[PDB]
Symmetry: C3
Subunit: 224 residues, 3 copies
């Protein structure tokens, strides 16, 4: 039944899903070590650290392609759309926001939707790298991977933003789960655009997104 | 009497004022902790650290706009115009140069003129960001702010140049005086170009520059 | 006998010499402190650290010229041509590869050929900077120098890649031999393109390359 994947390929991420990626990235940034004191004593650094979690893919993909990073800041609808989620995650009255989204089902849904945004980020970087370089495979892998897990690769300098400098925890030394999954996805969809992978783009899209959401849901259910 | 602000708006900064910004930035860089030993044992690193103080605004504004930083190095008149001030600040015979410019009135004048260069740097970044992005407010704030206090934002990596690595003293954690003032100015003049601020550009220019020079003069008089 | 330098100027570096630069840079990267454990426990970080040794000149010259660094990754023939040398330097059976190229004559030849690649990298950066900026001397010096010893200038962040963070060993504080030699060469050939240096390009090319190869050969013979 390939008629369902065609329906899945018509999804738009502007209203609902972008807020889900921003919310999962901002909450996951808050749950990190010493992130509450940053927002309590330096809202600027915590806000910028949140933006590195939300728009790290576009930032790294722009720096790697010699594209202006401030171009990501031009979309005031997305920047404000993430900054509101930041201010509600940290400075909501009685912390009613976080306590609402820390609930297990809501957290599962939000995270699972961020996993969906990751896909269109990977393909966006692959097709964009194709717009800059025709049949260059490594470029498409690098930019699609850069949009898939951008915040995870700038995680060292992002740590440097909040104030923690860990020169030992490099992403290449020990590849984390989301970064390595974004590598596998970038390679796969790069083989898809190059037609080296015998499957249509929509079906590979759907099966990859499902294989990601199922894994993260299993991780969050087995962690609690 | 708005006829005086029109006369103030016709100022040119190529001869006198650029040397004032370079001199205040180089002297303020020398007065930092452990900067004399750098120039005494490694003139290259002290020179580059001085260039990060002088041309940090153009460097950061160029990196943020995907513009070549080496483009700032093309203007050999400005680069030499600052390098001469560096070599005279550090390696002048009997230190007759620094001891002359460390005098309170001369230091007040030079610093106060650097405060004037900061304004045209902010507006240069705002109008330049307008040339790259029409009515994008955050871009104009970011580039005007990037030219206002560029050396203050690269101050971490600039510290890394001389040899001191302080991951705890981030500019976003504790915003210093010049950086936060450049933020306020970038926001104000950005509202001016967008015509959200009910005042002409020249008058806002003059009152902002005066409000800056008066504050720094008061700081230098109350510090000694 | 200027007829021999004309024959030397017709050299092509695509097959033999590029592999020599990649091999000397990868081997010299392995001989660094704690580089074997990186390749034994994290092949990704050791591979990227090797690419920073091989393509550091193009990377830094691309970042300084606002050119996409991923553009260096487009040439899959060169990237694979270096990655094969990396995998053979580290993971060859019985370490038969390294033990073969660590032999004194073979090491002398490979290093001496890397010294030859350095020249065409310097001139490539100088003529490229001329394509971006006509008669800007400092730009040509900066880009030619950036291609001459690129890995030596990113050596701090390259150290940060493997996991060692040394904020005290800056290249400007103590200029190493290859970096300072690349500075002298960039200045000389920049004076050549500007015709301030009374010598033809080919003769200066040959005498500079010889003056480099002789020095490195003398160093490797006096070190063992």
């Amino acid at each position: 039944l390939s008629e369902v994947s065609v329906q899945f390929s018509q999804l738009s991420m502007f209203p609902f899903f972008d807020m889900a990626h921003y919310l999962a990235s901002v909450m996951s940034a808050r749950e990190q070590a010493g992130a509450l004191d940053i927002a309590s004593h330096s809202p600027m650094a915590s806000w910028f650290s949140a933006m590195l979690h939300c728009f790290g893919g576009g930032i790294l993909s722009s720096i790697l392609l010699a594209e202006p990073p401030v171009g990501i800041l031009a979309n005031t609808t997305n920047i404000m759309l993430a900054s509101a989620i930041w201010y509600m995650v940290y400075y909501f009255p009685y912390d009613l926001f976080y306590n609402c989204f820390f609930f297990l089902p809501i957290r599962l849904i939000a995270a699972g939707m961020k996993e969906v945004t990751r896909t269109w980020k990977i393909l966006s970087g692959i097709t964009h790298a194709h717009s800059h370089y025709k049949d260059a495979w490594l470029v498409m892998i690098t930019i699609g991977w850069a949009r898939g897990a951008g915040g995870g690769l700038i995680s060292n300098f992002e740590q440097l933003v909040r104030g923690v400098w860990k020169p030992e925890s490099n992403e290449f030394l020990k590849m984390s789960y989301p970064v390595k999954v974004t590598l596998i996805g970038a390679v796969l969809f790069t083989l898809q655009h190059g037609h080296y992978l015998p499957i249509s783009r929509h079906n590979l899209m759907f099966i990859y997104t499902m294989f990601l959401v199922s894994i993260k849901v299993t991780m969050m259910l087995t962690h609690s």
